[PDB]
Design a binder for these strands. Structure first.
Lengths: 122, 119, 37, 134
RNA sequence: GUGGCCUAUCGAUCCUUUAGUCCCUCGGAAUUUGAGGCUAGAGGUGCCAGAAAAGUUACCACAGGGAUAACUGGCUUGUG
RNA sequence: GCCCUGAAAAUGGAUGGCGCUCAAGCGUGUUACCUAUACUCUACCGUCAGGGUUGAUAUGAUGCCCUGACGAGUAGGCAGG
RNA sequence: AAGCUCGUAUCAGUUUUAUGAGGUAAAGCGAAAACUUUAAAUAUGUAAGAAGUCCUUGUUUGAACGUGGACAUUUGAAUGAAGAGCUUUUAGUGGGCCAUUUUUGGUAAGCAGAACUGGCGAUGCGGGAUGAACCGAACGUAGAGUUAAGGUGCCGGAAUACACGCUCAUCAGACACCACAAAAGGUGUUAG
RNA sequence: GGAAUACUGCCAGCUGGGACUGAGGACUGCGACGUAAGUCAAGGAUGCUGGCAUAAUGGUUAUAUGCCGCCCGUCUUGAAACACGGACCAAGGAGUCUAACGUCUAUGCGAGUGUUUGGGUGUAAAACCCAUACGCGUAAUGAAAGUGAACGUAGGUUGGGGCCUCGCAAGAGGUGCACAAUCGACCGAUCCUGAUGUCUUCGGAUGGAUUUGAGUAAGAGCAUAGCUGUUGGGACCCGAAAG
């Protein structure tokens, strides 16, 4: 998957997510997938009845499987619906945006400031 | 050196009249001086069928499934060597994982600085 | 077309030599026709 | 995917109105087949002859079952000994009806069948040769 | 002892010819000449015929379509 | 690196205009601010899809209830009025 | 769509692994700059299994079609999704501009012919004072919030904000921009 | 030598100000604090108070103000515009009927099907009833004379929705419609082989080799109606130069 990112670099922003930002994302904008339909979690019964066949039975077990990349990672990931983020609340900085983060822009690999970006797009 | 119907062959020119020049096809015909090849070409979005006649030195054999057969052999080998025991075989190929933590030692290696002096 | 390696669709160069000699012999036949008449 | 019967036959509307309920609460695969067969057009619902029914009953071990045709049950004059079957269907020509009753069997309809074999036990489903037409 | 030798295209499905074990048909029925089929062969652009049977009209009538000429691309001036 | 010559006519005239010279000009850097039918959340209409439901006196069975995702349009095609 | 005929653990404008060809050379170094071995990804090709594999071993000791028998899921990389084909059958249309990427041929100059990717035509909305091709951008009806590209002296919503430098034009400059006039002239000014 | 603040980050830390929203309508769920009975900010807003009851809110309308909006229809894909039509009003004005074939859908009957050229009758161009014929179908193939579809349980294998048996359930087994692939059997035509008999040439027994047909191998058609496609008729309408 490194070469996928190297292909689509001019259109995305990526990096290494901490534990607290994963926790916030899953707790606030986390929607599961009961066969379809983008259902909101709001409970552990929905997680348990749909992923209990893999040992996951709580939203914290789900966060654990995510952050400590596990052997049920593909299933635990494709359980969640891609996150719908809003624009950042302070802006991006960067008068112009489509330049590599190294060159004073936004796209590319910022490698740790993805937390400072996602926590304001959350 | 006997090219027959069904074999799978490469192209190689040992001037530029036509440039397929290394696209792999399948033989359908053989004669004492030439060979027939087929080729799938992308015309819009589909693979349409082209036919070709090539000499002998301008052709060779392929080595495509060379690893496939050895790997299905070894898969069969460790499969039985696993049934013959108590095992966690996991006989699938994985991509290159990210390398893990280590410690480097500075005893014969004090880091020799350099600057863009250029030199 | 004799030495030209690949032809892009019977061996196709042998037909070419066949037509070559076809016209050659038609010429050399009409030669006798004109000599006789 | 055809869902609604395109006819105006009120009795066929009732037959569908019963079979949708059956196939919604029974989960016996026979009912879904019969429901899907009740939507087919008249050119996709060919007839089935008494002789094909007899040949079907002539296989081994299948001489005590009930045979079900969603189309019609025509007659045939090229057979002389007809078995003692029991045929449920949609329509019966006069010829086939008289031949079956003279043989000694019964003739019934799909709703009497729904009462008799609800899940569909001991039943056979036959379809007439479709593509024979142009 | 060298600075050359020769050349129309075209079909070849527009058709040349021939014979039959008891081959089949020819309108009411026979027989003999005759024709027509399908089964064989034997021939292939030599010998024909042509990619449409000629012009001119300024009174020239009807139905339609046409400009904008000096600005593609910063062009133009004094010395090949 | 900035600046001045490095040509080019003809009604009156154009960094869009006024105007601006430690700029309201040129290179660069740190921030705050303005604003699209774009992004997020919410309500209403419709379309599509997935579920539940004739059982009585309760009704519109082409019905009723629950949930989720979507909505540009010429030639042309289908459905309801 | 008319269409019901088959839904399979299969497909894909993607990556990875194996094998090819481009070989420029940066590899370096080859037994004497000739050698002939070698590093990454650079766009195209082929392949990566449950009608797939194993065992007795006929056909005239190698190879090809056999007989008969046996091995079901860590089932043979990643990522994403249950959606193509067969026949019946049918409405509209069928030869062109702009820009980008490579190749071929060019001349006073422009250029001419290719294949490929976007856009336009059928298309609104924000910005460039105005605009088919430029820059943003997933079009039902509304409320709140945040923003893209472009901007914050006045017209005009938004700092006559902060900080370091450079410039004086006898019609400066504030752009299609890294193009023609463009290579040179200047006792203008600055830094090397 | 001992500290501190800065900087980056984490808190399932505490506490203020402002703006928009209040969808849903008996109960059921997951929870929190409880000694417990019970309460709660936990599956969508309630409590207290005031004014007025009419042109006050709200609608329709005239104008003013701020910002926006190039004249309509048609015809050419580029200066994509230009070019052609439009003084205003009312009424008329353009994909219709028929004949022959075809796809699809509905209904009637079904190896059959079609009453209405005619006759009988009547409450009179209606409705009701009917005999004999004929079309299409139920059989093909050959240029034609002609010939004319069962070795078997109407066939062998490969899958194949469903059904029966065992199974706690997955699953296993048996049977298999329609349909598809392949090897067969039959019918016609072409090529051979050429008996029992013949009036001396008639006749074609038995067995083989390919190629071919919308062929057979327990029938599926006929009829009317509706939407439609092709062709002909003035054929969506007007507009012209002729013989």
């Amino acid at each position: 998957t490194l070469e996928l990112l190297k292909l689509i670099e001019p259109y995305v922003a990526y990096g290494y997510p901490s534990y607290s930002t994963i926790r916030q994302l899953v707790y606030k904008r986390g929607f599961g997938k009961i066969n379809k339909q983008r259902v909101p979690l709001s409970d552990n019964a929905i997680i348990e009845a749909n992923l209990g066949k893999y040992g996951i039975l709580s939203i914290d077990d789900l966060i654990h499987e995510i952050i400590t990349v596990g052997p049920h990672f593909k299933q635990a990931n494709n359980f969640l619906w891609p996150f719908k983020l809003s624009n950042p609340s302070g802006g991006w900085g960067v008068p112009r945006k489509f330049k590599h983060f190294i060159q004073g822009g936004s796209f590319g690999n910022r490698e740790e400031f993805i937390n400072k970006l996602v926590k304001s797009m959350n | 050196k006997v090219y027959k119907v069904g074999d799978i062959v490469d192209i190689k020119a040992n001037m530029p009249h036509k440039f397929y020049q290394g696209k792999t096809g399948v033989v359908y015909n053989v004669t004492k001086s030439s060979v027939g090849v087929i080729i799938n070409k992308m015309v819009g979005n589909r693979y349409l069928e082209k036919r070709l006649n090539l000499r002998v030195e301008h052709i060779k054999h392929s080595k495509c499934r060379q690893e496939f057969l050895e790997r299905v052999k070894a898969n069969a080998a460790k499969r039985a060597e696993a049934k013959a025991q108590g095992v966690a075989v996991q006989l699938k190929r994985q991509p290159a994982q990210p390398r893990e933590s280590r410690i480097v030692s500075t005893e014969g290696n004090v880091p020799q600085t350099l600057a863009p002096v250029p030199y | 077309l004799d030495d030209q390696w690949l032809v892009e669709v019977i061996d196709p160069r042998t037909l070419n030599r066949a037509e070559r000699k076809r016209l050659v012999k038609k010429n050399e036949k009409q030669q006798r026709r004109n000599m006789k008449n | 995917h055809r869902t609604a019967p395109k006819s105006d036959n009120v009795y066929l509307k009732l037959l569908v109105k019963l079979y949708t309920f059956l196939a919604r609460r029974t989960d016996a695969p026979f009912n879904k087949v019969v429901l899907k067969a009740l939507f087919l057009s008249k050119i996709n619902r060919p007839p089935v002859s008494v002789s094909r029914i007899a040949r079907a009953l002539k296989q081994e071990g299948a001489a005590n079952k009930t045979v079900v045709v969603v189309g019609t049950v025509t007659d045939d004059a090229r057979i002389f000994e007809f078995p003692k079957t029991t045929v449920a269907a949609l329509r019966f020509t006069a010829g086939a009806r008289a031949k079956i009753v003279k043989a000694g069997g019964e003739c019934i309809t799909l709703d009497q069948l729904a009462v008799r074999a609800p899940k569909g036990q001991n039943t056979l489903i036959l379809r007439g040769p479709r593509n024979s037409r142009e």
